[PDB]
Structure 1
Amino acid sequence: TTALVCDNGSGLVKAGFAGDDAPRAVFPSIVGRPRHQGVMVGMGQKDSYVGDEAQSKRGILTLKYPIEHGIITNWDDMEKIWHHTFYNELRVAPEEHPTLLTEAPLNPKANREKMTQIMFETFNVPAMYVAIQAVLSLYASGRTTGIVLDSGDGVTHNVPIYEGYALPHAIMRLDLAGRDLTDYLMKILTERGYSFVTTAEREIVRDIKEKLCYVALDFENEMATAASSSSLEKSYELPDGQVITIGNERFRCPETLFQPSFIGMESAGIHETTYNSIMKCDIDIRKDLYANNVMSGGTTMYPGIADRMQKEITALAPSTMKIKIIAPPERKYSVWIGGSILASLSTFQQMWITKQEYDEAGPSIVHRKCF
């Protein structure tokens, strides 16, 4: 009867039932094959771990992600992770409950067409629906207008939207996200000698990143604090026991969101592609978009990210009028929670994609369901 909502996270698959406040189970989107001998006779089974059991056993696995840049690449593994959601951790029959997949805007069509074809012809769900990420996040705001800095693990994107109506031409999207943060953090740990090489260490780099890295309010003046390096450094215990420490590399890594030339991609920062999105929008809406900026996605859980972009968009906006940065304390789950709302609306049960209308339509039916 009830619906399931399962945000296909680029880094962390978030899932749960409709109308629930918190998502039921959140596990990292990691499938992993083992890579060693296995001279034991009993424990050599289960030749592909996925999810949390791949997370704990990460030392003997080649951890690979099925989704990169918001684009689902390895469809063989992507079945394996969805089978882990429904059966292994939600323990629900997928043939009984309707689902609601979510995806980024401006991804390829085959990322959407295969995703519905692998949903019906494999899992036999009754009805599905595909939602744009950031337009779910306004339902989490409980507010019907304003652009969204939805920065995930794999992609960041801005979906400007006035009350009801979106701006499809002004949707901007950058591939710089948490993996591009993690890969750049791996580059700058080598300057302090902490050479973290392979995928098991690429996991523990993210544990360094999510526990330590903050973004600076003023980059140069706080870099000068790291010159008189007195109180900047913290220190992190690795899983083996030996401890690291990190100085200016702690805040220099999340400046990739603002200077994308650090990883060498030629783009504007997410403070500027914010303003470049609002300049693309029509002139009446611009007063309301400046008062309504929703930070969303797990990348935007950096401390100081709201105080930075409120300063930095103010540098780009005409200073005669106010800016606001709506950064709720549930930004990590905002796409799910707004997804949990939208499936629960009584005006929505005609907006699904049912199987009985799929069968004469084929996989192109989702292109005539909210583009």
Structure 2
Amino acid sequence: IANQPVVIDNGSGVIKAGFAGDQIPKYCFPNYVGRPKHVRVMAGALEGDIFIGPKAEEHRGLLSIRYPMEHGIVKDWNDMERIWQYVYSKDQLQTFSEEHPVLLTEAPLNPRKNRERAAEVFFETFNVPALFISMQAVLSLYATGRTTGVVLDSGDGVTHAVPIYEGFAMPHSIMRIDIAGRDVSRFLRLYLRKEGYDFHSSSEFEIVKAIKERACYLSINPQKDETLETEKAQYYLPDGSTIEIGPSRFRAPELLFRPDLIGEESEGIHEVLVFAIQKSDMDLRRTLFSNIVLSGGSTLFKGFGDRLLSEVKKLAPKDVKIRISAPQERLYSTWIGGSILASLDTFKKMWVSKKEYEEDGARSIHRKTF
């Protein structure tokens, strides 16, 4: 169509959206559906019963938090349809879901049926003229202007490292473990339960997320600081109650580097990056160690980069210039790269036209997406 496409950063924590060709996503709202758990009695109360966006955040106590995307995989198609309609409604974009192309981000190595049913929604419920599902790493490289680099991101629920050497993504070195922000938050909830401060409501888990995002520093020395004793700084709840955090503030974000804590054998973030670099070729790992690009909100902890340097220096060979290059608008890097990709003249050649999907279907989707 002779209009501008929509770049939807379909993340698991914050489903960022906006029109292509912009510079900052104008509509950033969390990825959850809010349904009231109480019973309305007094007239003139709120209606709709399905709160999404700032309405759910403004009134958390009324509704029950339910996430539709668990570890990057859509688990509630009805909730994702409602969130997508919420994006196309007058409260978020006011346009039509049948007069603009859609740039839908997606984590790598996801199941095939997610892509299939996602395009089924966008081409059957919504009748979009063109849909192009894409990786998050390529988009981050698009936004950073680089072409090389290993994109090590960590969103709310999926951590992965996709090495790319001048636009040639190696589809076998891609590592991906489902241990990120939401799971770290859940582990933090467990730690807080061990401390004495319990939180069990769904509308209270986001308060736990706020505690995760405010005072959680990653220590350089894990066991050396584990055997010590901190000063136990406090935190202020929205209720006004004061909570002493204790050792959970540094023992909870270590899950990204020790997935054994949650009780699941896998690799840490540093092992994900190092194995993603070592699964590549000999003549490419020097540039990839010198070109590491971060992304994702779970990489914003205090001391995350320092601990990555320590771990990588422990694993990478000696005398190799390691360079971690993270951006400043880390939470919006994927969306900015989506804006740059969708604002290109060549973007019309790489999507999936509606007629193409009507002619073939799933095969065309898998044929045009990575």
TM-score normalised by length of structure 2:
0.96
Matched position secondary structure for 2:255: helix
Matched position secondary structure for 1:17: coil
Where does residue 315 of structure 1 map in the other structure? 314
Matched position secondary structure for 1:14: strand
In the alignment, the residues of structure 2 paired with residue 19 and residue 234 of structure 1 have an alpha-carbon distance, to the nearest angstrom, of 44
Where does residue 165 of structure 1 map in the other structure? 168
Where does residue 361 of structure 2 map in the other structure? 362
Where does residue 245 of structure 1 map in the other structure? 244
In the alignment, the residues of structure 2 paired with residue 40 and residue 79 of structure 1 have an alpha-carbon distance, to the nearest angstrom, of 30
The equivalent position to 1:110 in structure 2, one of 110, 113, 123, is 113
Structure 2: which 5+ residue stretches go unaligned? none
TM-score normalised by length of structure 1:
0.96
In the alignment, the residues of structure 1 paired with residue 133 and residue 307 of structure 2 have an alpha-carbon distance, to the nearest angstrom, of 33
In the alignment, the residues of structure 2 paired with residue 44 and residue 84 of structure 1 have an alpha-carbon distance, to the nearest angstrom, of 17
Moved more, 268-277 or 174-183: 268-277
Matched position secondary structure for 2:282: coil
Note the C-alpha offset of 1:141.
Answer: 1.6
Q: State whether structure 2 residue 132 is matched by structure 1 residue 129.
A: yes
Note the C-alpha offset of 1:356.
Answer: 2.1
1:85-126 Cα offsets, whole Å, 9 max, x none, are 111211222222211001011111110011111001122122
Q: CA RMSD in A?
A: 1.3
Where does residue 51 of structure 1 map in the other structure? 53
Where does residue 21 of structure 1 map in the other structure? 23
AA matched with 1:15: A
AA matched with 1:22: I
In the alignment, the residues of structure 2 paired with residue 303 and residue 19 of structure 1 have an alpha-carbon distance, to the nearest angstrom, of 33
1:191-224 Cα offsets, whole Å, 9 max, x none, are 2211111211101000111111121122233335
Q: State whether structure 2 residue 233 is matched by structure 1 residue 234.
A: yes
AA matched with 1:97: H
In the alignment, the residues of structure 2 paired with residue 271 and residue 357 of structure 1 have an alpha-carbon distance, to the nearest angstrom, of 41
In the alignment, the residues of structure 1 paired with residue 251 and residue 285 of structure 2 have an alpha-carbon distance, to the nearest angstrom, of 31
In the alignment, the residues of structure 1 paired with residue 77 and residue 304 of structure 2 have an alpha-carbon distance, to the nearest angstrom, of 34
Matched position secondary structure for 1:157: strand
Which residues of 2 match residues 132-281 of structure 1 at below 5 A? 132-224=135-227, 226-227=228-229, 229-230=230-231, 233-281=232-280
In the alignment, the residues of structure 1 paired with residue 299 and residue 143 of structure 2 have an alpha-carbon distance, to the nearest angstrom, of 15
Matched position secondary structure for 2:263: coil
Question: Number of residues paired by the alignment?
Answer: 367
Where does residue 338 of structure 1 map in the other structure? 337
AA matched with 1:309: L
In the alignment, the residues of structure 1 paired with residue 128 and residue 276 of structure 2 have an alpha-carbon distance, to the nearest angstrom, of 37
In the alignment, the residues of structure 2 paired with residue 235 and residue 364 of structure 1 have an alpha-carbon distance, to the nearest angstrom, of 55
- Residues 3 and 98 of structure 1 are in contact (CA less than 8 Å); yes or no, is this contact kept in structure 2? yes
Note the C-alpha offset of 1:345.
Answer: 1.6
1:132-186 Cα offsets, whole Å, 9 max, x none, are 1111111122111121111110111111111110110111100001111011000
In the alignment, the residues of structure 2 paired with residue 15 and residue 301 of structure 1 have an alpha-carbon distance, to the nearest angstrom, of 21
AA matched with 2:188: L
AA matched with 1:155: V
Where does residue 297 of structure 1 map in the other structure? 296
Structure 1: which 5+ residue stretches go unaligned? none
Matched position secondary structure for 1:359: helix
Matched position secondary structure for 1:33: strand
Matched position secondary structure for 1:266: coil
Note the C-alpha offset of 1:44.
Answer: 5.8
In the alignment, the residues of structure 1 paired with residue 265 and residue 290 of structure 2 have an alpha-carbon distance, to the nearest angstrom, of 29
- Residues 154 and 175 of structure 1 are in contact (CA less than 8 Å); yes or no, is this contact kept in structure 2? yes
Matched position secondary structure for 1:101: strand
